[PDB]
Amino acid sequence: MQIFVKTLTGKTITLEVEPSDTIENVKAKIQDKEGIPPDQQRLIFAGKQLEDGRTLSDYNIQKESTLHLVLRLRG
Amino acid sequence: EVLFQGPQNISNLLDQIFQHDEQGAYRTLFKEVVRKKDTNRKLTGIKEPYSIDETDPEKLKKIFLRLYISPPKLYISRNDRISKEHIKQILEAYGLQEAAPEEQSYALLAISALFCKYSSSGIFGTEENSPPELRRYACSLLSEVGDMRLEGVSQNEIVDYQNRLRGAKNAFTCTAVLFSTIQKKLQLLHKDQKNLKKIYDQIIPLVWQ
């Protein structure tokens, strides 16, 4: 199924995923597309930070859902 | 003259960095904030009160894009390089076009520190978030410092600073602390060098010294 990952800078990233995929798997797919190291990625859905180890289905993330990406860069 | 030229010095630098800010509001903001110890106006585009604008991240990406040799990616890379022309411009802004390499390299470290401060929790960043284009600019200036070399700063220290700015695994990313660290380095380096102390006082805003 397709999901979308919206960046802060305007780009929307399209991914092909399965409901059984882990958040880490999704971060690795973002790395494939954009080069961003998984350890720097913060993924957000419905105002919640998504945790590595949990699955898309765990967060009831369905087809055509939109996630948001923030880089872990502290001021 | 150092007192009278303070505002003109920072303004001249920011006119170069923000030359592609056609609307001009970020250029003005970066100049005005240097009178302040801190500000509630944050450029992270992230709601977390702070004055937030969700368009800040895209607009900053667009303003800084042309300063690089190749268009940067979303993440910060030690292979992101500022154009040699823009390096010349920012040095010319301070009358250092033909100064010694040791003075030019010190100036670039100071400008890097300045962007660490801009990106930090007291200025345009928060405890947990920080505008990536400000960090990217500081990181890429450090690549120039590393190539020119600077007495009192090792290549390992440069890479450490870059790893923190870029968010490398196992690096403490906080730019408020990184600014303090680079500031202490710049101070140690100008302790017995009046020429370097002059460059420091041209670049670092009074309120942030």
Nearest-angstrom CA–CA distance, B144 and B141: 5
CA neighbor of A34 nearest in space, from A16, A56, A11: A11
Number of domains chain B is built from: 1
Report the CATH number that the domain containing residue A23 is assigned in CATH: 3.10.20.90
Number of domains chain A is built from: 1
The tally of CA atoms less than 13 A away on the side-chain side of residue A26 is 33
> Would you say how long chain B is, in residues?
209
Nearest-angstrom CA–CA distance, B204 and B110: 7
Determine contact: A34 vs chain B, CB below 8 A: yes
Do the Cβ atoms of B54 and B45 come closer than 8 Å? Answer: yes
Nearest-angstrom CA–CA distance, B74 and B179: 23
Q: Could you tell me if residue A55 is inside a domain?
A: yes
Q: Could you tell me if residue A75 is inside a domain?
A: no
Q: How was this structure determined?
A: X-ray
Do the Cβ atoms of A64 and A4 come closer than 8 Å? Answer: yes
Binary contact (B174, A74; C-beta < 8 A): yes
Nearest-angstrom CA–CA distance, B85 and B126: 32
Q: Which domain holds residue A57?
A: 2-68
Q: Could you tell me if residue A10 is inside a domain?
A: yes
Determine contact: B132 vs chain A, CB below 8 A: yes
Q: Could you tell me if residue A28 is inside a domain?
A: yes
In this complex, the residue of A10, A34, A71 whose CB is nearest that of residue B58 is A10
Chain B residue numbers touching A75 (CB-CB < 8 A): 44, 119-121, 124-130, 174-176
Strands (E), A1-75: 2-6, 12-16, 41-45, 48-49, 66-71
What Å distances lie between residue B200 and B99, B128, B173, B193, CA to CA?
14, 29, 24, 11
Sheet strand arrangement including A48-49: A12-16, A2-6, A66-71, A41-45, A48-49
Q: Which domain holds residue B71?
A: 3-208
Task: Work out the minimum CA distance from B176 to partner chain A, whole angstroms.
Answer: 6
Nearest-angstrom CA–CA distance, A7 and B61: 12
Say what the alpha-carbon torsion angle B165, B170, B176, B180 is, to the nearest 10 degrees: -90
What Å distances lie between residue B175 and A18, B31, B160, CA to CA?
37, 20, 12
Q: Could you tell me if residue A73 is inside a domain?
A: no
Q: Which ranges constitute the DSSP H helices of B75-154?
A: 84-92, 101-118, 132-148
Report the CATH number that the domain containing residue B60 is assigned in CATH: 1.10.4140.10
Which DSSP letter does residue B23 get?
S
* Helix, coil or strand: residue B178: helix
Which DSSP letter does residue B153 get?
B
Tokens standing for B12? 């001249």
Q: Is the dihedral of CA B102, B189, B12, B62 positive or negative?
A: positive
Chain A residue numbers touching B132 (CB-CB < 8 A): 71, 73
Q: Could you tell me if residue A35 is inside a domain?
A: yes
Binary contact (A8, B73; C-beta < 8 A): no
Cβ-proximal residues to A10 (8 Å cutoff; 6+ apart), any chain: B58
Resolution number, Å:
1.4
In this complex, the residue of B74, B76, B124 whose CB is nearest that of residue A7 is B74
Cβ-proximal residues to B177 (8 Å cutoff; 6+ apart), any chain: none
Phi, psi of A68 (to 5 degrees): -120, 145
Q: Could you tell me if residue A74 is inside a domain?
A: no
Name the amino acid, one letter, at A1. M
H or E segment and range at residue A56? none
Task: Give the residue carrying structure tokens 């399965």.
Answer: A18
Q: Are strands A2-6 and A41-45 parallel, antiparallel or unpaired?
A: unpaired
Other C-beta atoms within 10 Å of A60: how many?
Answer: 10
Nearest-angstrom CA–CA distance, B52 and A74: 16
Determine contact: B175 vs chain A, CB below 8 A: yes
Tokens standing for B100? 């010694």
Q: End-to-end alpha-carbon separation of chain A, Å?
A: 36
Do the Cβ atoms of B119 and B125 come closer than 8 Å? Answer: yes
Chain B residue numbers touching A7 (CB-CB < 8 A): 74
Nearest-angstrom CA–CA distance, B143 and B135: 13
Determine contact: B61 vs chain A, CB below 8 A: yes
Binary contact (A9, B57; C-beta < 8 A): yes
